[PDB]
Amino acid sequence: ATFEIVNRCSYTVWAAASKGDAALDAGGRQLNSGESWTINVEPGTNGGKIWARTDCYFDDSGSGICKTGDCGGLLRCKRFGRPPTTLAEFSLNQYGKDYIDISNIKGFNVPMNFSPTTRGCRGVRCAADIVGQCPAKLKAPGGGCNDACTVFQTSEYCCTTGKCGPTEYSRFFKRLCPDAFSYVLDKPTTVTCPGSSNYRVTFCPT
Template sequence: MVPGGGRQLDRGQSWPINVNPGTTGGRVRARTGCSFDGNGNGHCQTGDCGGKLACTAYGSPPNTLAEFALNQFQNLDFIDISLVDGFNVPMDFSPTSGCSRGIRCTADIVGQCPNELKAPGGCNNPCTVFKTNEYCCNSGSCGPTNYSRFFKERCPDAYSYPKDDQTSTFTCPGGTNYKVTFCP
């Protein structure tokens, strides 16, 4: 989440995050292949946060993101799983109360990643690799590509490119509680 935090979680561990009142949004991501010293300095193979355990910036691609915008239009929360920054771990992003629609992305994207997008520990998004408007949507207009279709076919509910709103954003009533599960 930005601003910051970070904690090593071993298999089966959880980390409750209480979002402060008035928080309007955030991101949760897994980082993999990490090594930190006692001062929280080090690096991660995927999702690195500038060499810090306690993130103060967005993680570097590739990383699977759970994104949320709280108490927005008509007191709704907007949630999504985004693969726009690539993919590093399967994820489930689900409400724990007050709403029934969760989102999952559990495909073997790393194992099936196109050669051009392969990265150590993950699968990059095409914008990171090619840096063109076709993939990055810098001009505001872009559509699906063969690469975004690769992600969408495997995780139909997840964002596959920056303008993939219609099939990738879900709503719950404001005040809903959520959980993010890595490698469900």
Template sequence: TVALLDFVFRLACTGCSFDGNGNGHCQTGDCGGKLACTAYGSPPNTLAEFALNQYQNLDFIDISLVDGFNVPMDFNPTSGCSRGIRCTADIVGQCPNMLKAPGGCNNPCTVFKTNEYCCNSGGCGPTNYSKFFKNRCPDAYSYPKDDQTSTFTCPGGTNYKVIFCP
């Protein structure tokens, strides 16, 4: 296991309305009513996560659906690496009824709040709900312990382009 330092994320917010002072609300990915998001937004939201120039001078990148899904995403290197990742399935349109949310599809942890889905202690494995996400977006994290098929590396110094709604 590699400990990643300085892990950064970008999330998509939808259905937003803000005043001139940056106060307002978003239907998905809301950041406590603030335009300048300084933390994870409220689920459901699709996340691009990255830790640059880490262990053995590698960048670690992923698309996470652990907080659910609100928009499709491409996360592609523009130089220095050939492996991009994407999640462009119609997850909102195909979302299981129990996970549906206005503007998105919640992760089961958000809905059920149990260790089976949240992986708060000990080991956990894929569930029928995480398999729903994984089948549609094989490169994306579908539950918190989904590291082996969802974290990708590129050489440190690689440039990237994150595209929401490609």
């Protein structure tokens, strides 16, 4: 399956794509404002994620640091990124269906739309000004809006026991972005798409 990853933000981002134990495609790429990156994700991939990283610095070998979403200091990510990261999440070809979502469970850094480019389902979007509105205790000065599990490391935010409720923090993300996951046991906002759909992830869709 093909994903087109498009930066509509006025600022450069460093896109990233991983399934946690490996890169997806080339794993990461600088996207100046307006640029697009086309990747192929193997059919059947479970638990893939795409995100943006902000304010990155790399040496000529592709090692450095990003203010948000850093993946072990690499340009070409092979592992998931450090919160806060708005996440486009997907599992493909699962018994004939694809499943897509946006999640704020690992915080928010850049607004996102995640839509099919083929027929048969809708997209989802989280494009509110979460960073500007972020609760003080969740603000990353490094940049972004952390999730409460990252900040507080409690069983309730992290959903450690498998049971948790919404929280004052999760409900902030949910109020602004109803279409994205706000905590582990949120009512799912997963969209079921035809198996083998193709997609576009747009940063700063507005």
